[PDB]
Amino acid sequence: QELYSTPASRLDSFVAQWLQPHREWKEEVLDAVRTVEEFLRQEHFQGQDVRVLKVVKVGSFGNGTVLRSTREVELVAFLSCFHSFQEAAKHHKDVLRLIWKTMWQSQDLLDLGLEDLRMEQRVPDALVFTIQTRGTAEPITVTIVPAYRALGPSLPNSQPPPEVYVSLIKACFCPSFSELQRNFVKHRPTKLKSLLRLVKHWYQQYVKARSPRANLPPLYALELLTIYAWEMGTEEDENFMLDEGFTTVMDLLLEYEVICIYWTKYYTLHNAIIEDCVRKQLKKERPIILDPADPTLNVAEGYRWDIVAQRASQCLKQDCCYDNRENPISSWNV
């Protein structure tokens, strides 16, 4: 069975039965990742004496959208030796090499079958490796990106002080705000997570897999578009029709040339400098999907939305976007 041959009326069952990972498998993976997290927090890295002050899971394991097919766990490490955005940028690779050097001597990680260490140019660079789980000894890929801790402790989803974004804009994808990128997707209703899984699965299997060399947009852009569709289309209803949501996202993808989306979730227009930044962003070539966590980033800029629209057009012709009386599923209003 696959998505395109799944009737719209059966999408809830498809997501639940085909796309959800087994809960014990997820726990197996997180148990192994915990050892990496503990290593990072506890190790006195010998650069000065360097510490990872905080480690956060991001991407699918961080925001609750892990799929059956997910085989990577993404971590962001906040470093003691970065005191500005500029310092993090300058010493990003230095820190990854330091962490890598030290991992090869870690009895704990060696006992988890650590292998395949390399740096990958993931914009920004990531240290990438595999470890083996404790039960099955199955391999899982783990990635680490270093960050300047620009934000202090607070409730999930409070607003950063405007001065943080003023400094960002003065300083000239920003892992300093990765907790916010996480939270924006994580702190949503269960059924929205099902729609996110569905869209991500579709994107990976029918778009990314088919054009693996193309400059396709990041999954985050698709997450933001999906959230937008739901927020506007249902007035943030925890109860909604999954099939209508999926069709709505496909329709929106067709219209990429006129998409202009932003939020004042983590920044508002009250600060003149932030307002000026956002105003400037919104006048640029569309699609614009402004990062709710970072007013300087149009997450959609520069990517092959033309390819995505081509696949969305095909998707809309499939059983997953038709009812059982051969009527197209109707999309939400905005």
Numbering used by the authors: 5 to 51, 57 to 181, 187 to 348
Question: Which text from the study accompanies this structure?
Answer:
We expressed the OLD (42 kDa) in E. coli and purified it to ∼95% homogeneity by immobilized metal affinity chromatography, affinity chromatography and size exclusion chromatography. Crystallization conditions for the OLD were established using standard commercial screens and the optimized crystals diffracted to 1.6 Å. Phases were determined by molecular replacement using the structure of porcine OAS1 as a search model. However, no density was observed for the four most N-terminal residues or for the two most C-terminal residues and the C-terminal 6xHis-tag. Likewise, two loop regions spanning the residues 52–56 and 182–186 did not display well-defined electron density. The C-terminal lobe is a four-helix bundle with a three-stranded mixed β-sheet with an additional interstrand α-helix connection. The crystal structure of the OLD exhibits a high similarity with active OAS1 and both proteins form the αN4 helix, which is absent in inactive OAS1. Notably, only after the binding of dsRNA does OAS1 form a rigid αN4 helix, which participates in coordinating the triphosphate of the donor ATP in 2-5A synthesis, however, in OASL the αN4 is intrinsically present.
The 2′-5′ oligoadenylate synthetases (OASs) are a family of IFN- and virus-induced antiviral restriction factors that provide protection against a wide spectrum of RNA and DNA viruses. OASL, on the other hand, is devoid of enzymatic activity in part due to an incomplete catalytic triad in which the third carboxyl acid in position 152 has been substituted by a threonine. Recently it was discovered that the UbLD of OASL could substitute for K63-linked pUb and interact with the CARDs of RIG-I. OASL thereby enhances RIG-I signaling leading to an amplified antiviral response.
